[PDB]
């Protein structure tokens, strides 16, 4: 997101606005803004790996924007879109990944590619070497926003089961 | 399948050092996933956008 400096509302604000985002939602539910149509008037910017040596980023769109839960500069030029989009495809499936250890994330991101579920829908047509399809593939009760874009809710990985963290004597 | 489509790889050589590109760097922020990597002989060598 690009952040203009001088606002007639005083302090500092990012240029995009509620009217624009309403127009976006309307375009979505039409089922004629695009991402490109949002580009062509200076609302977002593509930034390579170097201009970060020339710019300044805000986490939230509120973090310094007005002048027992969690513990959380006035020259911002950009604010990032959403901090969860520093992740990758596999790691966007781990629920609450900010709430555990990083090597555990790395293991999970490795193991998830070994999971089985569906993989496509024309699988009744495609001859293939080895295929693995399970019976009753359920979307997960917990979820995050990204896996909506990953179409994961449409093609789930496994089933969800009732667990119990006990030591029932043996095994 | 999606993860395999977006996937990057570099060559290094035989053994290599430590602070050479195996370890994660500051500049990697927001571009390459700081969580995924295969482990063993490719950690820090094969990365995903």
């Amino acid at each position: 997101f690009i952040v203009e400096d001088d606002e007639s509302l005083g302090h500092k604000e990012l240029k995009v606005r509620k009217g624009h985002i309403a127009k976006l939602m309307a375009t979505e539910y039409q089922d004629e803004y695009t991402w490109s149509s949002l580009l062509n008037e200076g609302l977002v910017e593509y930034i390579d790996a170097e201009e970060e040596e020339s710019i300044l980023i805000a986490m939230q769109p509120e973090d310094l924007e007005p002048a027992a839960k969690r513990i959380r500069a006035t020259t911002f030029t950009h604010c990032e879109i959403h901090p969860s989009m520093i992740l990758g495809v596999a790691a966007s499936i781990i629920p609450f990944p900010d709430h555990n250890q990083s090597p555990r994330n790395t293991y999970q991101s490795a193991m998830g590619k070994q999971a089985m579920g569906v993989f496509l829908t024309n699988y009744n047509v495609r001859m293939d070497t080895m295929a693995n399809i399970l019976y009753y593939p359920q979307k997960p009760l917990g979820t995050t926003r990204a896996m909506e874009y990953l179409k994961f809710r449409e093609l789930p990985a496994g089933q969800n089961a009732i667990v119990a963290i006990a030591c029932y004597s043996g095994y | 399948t999606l993860s395999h489509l977006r996937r990057t790889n570099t060559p290094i050589g035989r053994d290599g050092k430590l602070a050479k590109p195996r370890q994660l760097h500051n500049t990697h922020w927001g571009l390459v996933c700081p969580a995924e990597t295969p482990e063993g002989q490719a950690c820090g060598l094969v990365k995903n956008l």
Partner: peptide, 30 residues
């Protein structure tokens, strides 16, 4: 208002627009 700022929940609209345009394999295709 239309010119009010954006609460952080809203940006998923922008993300939806981005993905609806580009897709995911766009760099390969491009």
């Amino acid at each position: 208002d239309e010119s009010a700022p954006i609460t952080a929940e809203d940006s998923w609209a922008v993300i939806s627009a981005f993905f609806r345009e580009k897709g995911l394999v766009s760099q390969q295709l491009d």
